[PDB]
Design an enzyme around this catalytic site. Sequence first.
Site, short mmCIF file in Angstrom:
data_model
loop_
_atom_site.label_atom_id
_atom_site.label_comp_id
_atom_site.label_asym_id
_atom_site.label_seq_id
_atom_site.Cartn_x
_atom_site.Cartn_y
_atom_site.Cartn_z
N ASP A 174 -7.53 -7.43 -0.39
CA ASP A 174 -6.66 -7.62 0.77
C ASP A 174 -7.52 -7.41 2.00
O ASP A 174 -8.43 -6.58 1.97
CB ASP A 174 -5.49 -6.65 0.72
CG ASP A 174 -6.04 -5.26 1.01
OD1 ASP A 174 -6.47 -4.55 0.09
OD2 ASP A 174 -6.06 -4.93 2.21
N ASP A 211 -1.98 8.25 -2.63
CA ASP A 211 -3.25 8.91 -2.74
C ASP A 211 -3.65 9.49 -1.38
O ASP A 211 -2.89 9.26 -0.43
CB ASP A 211 -4.34 7.94 -3.20
CG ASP A 211 -4.58 6.86 -2.16
OD1 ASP A 211 -3.65 6.58 -1.37
OD2 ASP A 211 -5.70 6.30 -2.12
N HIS A 254 -6.17 -21.61 9.51
CA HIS A 254 -7.43 -22.10 8.96
C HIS A 254 -8.12 -20.99 8.19
O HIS A 254 -8.63 -21.14 7.07
CB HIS A 254 -8.33 -22.65 10.08
CG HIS A 254 -9.74 -22.70 9.58
ND1 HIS A 254 -10.15 -23.64 8.66
CD2 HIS A 254 -10.81 -21.92 9.84
CE1 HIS A 254 -11.43 -23.44 8.38
NE2 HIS A 254 -11.84 -22.41 9.09
N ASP A 303 0.87 -1.17 0.00
CA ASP A 303 0.00 0.00 0.00
C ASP A 303 0.92 1.23 0.00
O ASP A 303 2.07 1.05 0.40
CB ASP A 303 -0.94 0.05 1.19
CG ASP A 303 -2.09 1.02 0.97
OD1 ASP A 303 -2.13 1.67 -0.11
OD2 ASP A 303 -2.94 1.12 1.88
N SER A 304 0.45 2.38 -0.42
CA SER A 304 1.28 3.55 -0.67
C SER A 304 1.46 4.42 0.57
O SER A 304 2.29 5.32 0.58
CB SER A 304 0.65 4.36 -1.82
OG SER A 304 -0.58 4.92 -1.37
N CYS A 338 -7.57 -28.33 10.05
CA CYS A 338 -8.81 -29.08 10.06
C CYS A 338 -8.56 -30.57 9.89
O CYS A 338 -9.39 -31.41 10.22
CB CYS A 338 -9.75 -28.57 8.96
SG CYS A 338 -10.45 -26.97 9.43
N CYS A 359 -7.45 -27.51 5.04
CA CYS A 359 -6.22 -27.00 5.65
C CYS A 359 -5.64 -27.97 6.67
O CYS A 359 -6.31 -28.86 7.20
CB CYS A 359 -6.54 -25.63 6.23
SG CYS A 359 -7.08 -25.63 7.95
N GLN A 385 -10.58 7.21 -6.56
CA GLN A 385 -11.25 7.94 -5.51
C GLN A 385 -12.51 8.56 -6.12
O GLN A 385 -12.85 8.23 -7.25
CB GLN A 385 -10.30 8.97 -4.91
CG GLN A 385 -9.08 8.34 -4.26
CD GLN A 385 -9.48 7.43 -3.11
OE1 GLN A 385 -10.67 7.38 -2.78
NE2 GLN A 385 -8.51 6.74 -2.53
N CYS A 400 -12.98 -28.05 4.99
CA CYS A 400 -11.72 -27.38 4.86
C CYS A 400 -10.59 -28.41 4.80
O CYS A 400 -10.57 -29.35 5.59
CB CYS A 400 -11.52 -26.41 6.02
SG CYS A 400 -9.93 -25.56 5.99
#
EC number: 2.4.2.29
Lengths: 359, 359
Positions: free
Chosen positions: B257, B133, B326, B92-93, B300, B297, B180, B295
């Site tokens: 994200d 920004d 998880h 991120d900026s 699990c 993973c 924006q 799941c």
Amino acid sequence: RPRFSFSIAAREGKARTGTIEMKRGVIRTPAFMPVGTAATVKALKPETVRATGADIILGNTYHLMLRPGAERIAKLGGLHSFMGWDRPILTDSGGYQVMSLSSEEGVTFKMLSPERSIEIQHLLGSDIVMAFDECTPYPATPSRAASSMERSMRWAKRSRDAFDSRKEQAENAALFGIQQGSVFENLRQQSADALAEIGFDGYAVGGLAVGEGQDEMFRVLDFSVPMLPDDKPHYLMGVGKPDDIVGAVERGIDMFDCVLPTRSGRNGQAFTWDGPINIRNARFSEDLKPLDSECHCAVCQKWSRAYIHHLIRAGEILGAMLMTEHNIAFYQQLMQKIRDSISEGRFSQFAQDFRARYF
Amino acid sequence: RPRFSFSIAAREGKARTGTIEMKRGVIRTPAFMPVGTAATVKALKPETVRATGADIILGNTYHLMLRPGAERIAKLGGLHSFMGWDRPILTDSGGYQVMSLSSEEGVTFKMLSPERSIEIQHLLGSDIVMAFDECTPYPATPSRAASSMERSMRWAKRSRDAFDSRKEQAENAALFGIQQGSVFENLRQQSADALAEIGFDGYAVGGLAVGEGQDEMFRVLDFSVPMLPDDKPHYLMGVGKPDDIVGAVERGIDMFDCVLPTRSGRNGQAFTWDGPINIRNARFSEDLKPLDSECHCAVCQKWSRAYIHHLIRAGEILGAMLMTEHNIAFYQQLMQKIRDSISEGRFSQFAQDFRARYF
Ligand SMILES: Nc1nc2cc3[nH]c(NCc4cccc5ccccc45)nc3cc2c(=O)[nH]1
Ligand SMILES: Nc1nc2cc3[nH]c(NCc4cccc5ccccc45)nc3cc2c(=O)[nH]1
Ligand SMILES: [Zn+2]
Ligand SMILES: [Zn+2]
């Protein structure tokens, strides 16, 4: 596999190296047991615990008997299943923890008796069951240690009978008695004699790592350990600074447990062959070196001090994970180095080479 | 490998699926980027992050520019090397973080400008650089959004020129502009136009996930996303409740994200296909079922709700690790399910099947 079979493969002085064969795996001795107090070795997956080289982990009936509880762990398929560790687990008996954390029949706290202790550890599915004892407050008078020791031996025989009473546990588990007597040799003898007369699978030295200092701890080990049956493992409970372990192995101890690698790990202390480092120190902020220049662990292979420094300073959970894994890894490497130097008969030189660099 | 190449492999409605090819790896889109705010995805090793299926992680210049610092990360070999993640990192900026966490030239806080922002992300070795920004406060008046948007577009071109000025970064990295204009369509158009006129590798929608609610968020995505260049990735910053992601993919978003899986993971919330569960609940204390019945993973596969329940209730770090893994795993499975259902042209039915079970 056998229920419990201790074999000494090599010796050097009073140091021994070998194996304990148990149904859930082999324990290479001298062994360091990572401590898994709440059905976890803090910040490590069992697999990670295993990858560091641990053969057996320590659990406490006191903690688990409260949370989540013994019957419940049993209902849940046992401690092994519950926490995802399928190798031997040694459960402390609850004797030290009711003390620091919280009659003849047993101890009432906010009731733990020899019979319930054993019953709980059976509920947990413990492979190695600790007799339920009265950890000796230190210091303590000769008379006091004596009476406190003798309750423990009476509890030792009760422990023994309860254990022997439970067919399943007798068949699949091991029972270790605990010697008490504080720093007093004659008490230590009395207790070893009573324990031996009862007979156990293994003999722990309790009552040490009570702030007596390494000197007086080693002093007691000096006379106390040879009084225990040579043919059985000797377990020094709660001891583990790296140099404590070396000196206790030199004195005939085969097993160790200690919260030190894990807890000090979470607090910023990394063990290295050149002694512990505090990774929070500003000096590590641009240190691209691994925590320890030799350590084989995944953490030292992958991350720099600078990163772990950053991590610990930011309170990042990954900091704790990396430090703890390195530290348990370090402890296991030390045990491995101890095992190999004993079996190669150069344990003496190891100890001195170790001490030389480490301090 | 290419510097930046976005290829749409399949579409359904406004949903796209494809890949972004970058020098440090391929990013399968729609992509969920685990957030690694302090040069770590909280309580996960990069490898674990990778095993959950993440292709790219998000970093913030704001956090790293302070600790451990941008020049220092650079000196340390870059963010990738520093944290042990060798795949694309999106930084991120600094625009949103200086806001929530702390002129025309830029922002002074206790100075971040377009030029320094880009310079920092270059210092970090960011693969995908976010234009710097002014995140739009929400709500905000039409006039206010307008001026705030237009500063952002002026900063967008400055961002562009700084980036283009740094040969190395221009050659190896990607620059995404950020639209924006708040909830205002004409502002959103103005901004998309300015961004497109400048030209970027990818187009983010900023200004959402500002507490506008899913309805109004989707409403804006409805008109805002089609204004961005179709041939470039569309990145909805900071969005990730599972249902937000599904509805944003339906509206043309390729990248996401969100701190939600990690943070809610540490707080006891486990995502399941039948909606989140709070594992702290007493109802899970003897629940031998895995967190989620489907799941794949590692967590699990291995541990029961009862254990994780125990762990989280005891504040055990392993609780956080298991929950987080998880949850990121869940998020990645959802993205995978979204990718496959789009490429199989059944994304519509997925979304409804998903929503049906999940709520
Ligand atoms: N049954 C029984 N269990 C014991 C457990 C012991 N643990 C220790 N040392 C643990 C420890 C680790 C780290 C710091 C410490 C500081 C003060 C006291 C103990 C510390 N000694 C134990 C003795 C017994 C015992 O005699 N019986
Ligand atoms: N440059 C830029 N970055 C942005 C980052 C954003 N992140 C979010 N959402 C994150 C988030 C996650 C979880 C809870 C939250 C609660 C309130 C506000 C945000 C929350 N929105 C972002 C917008 C921008 C942006 O416009 N520009
Ligand atoms: Zn290491
Ligand atoms: Zn799972």
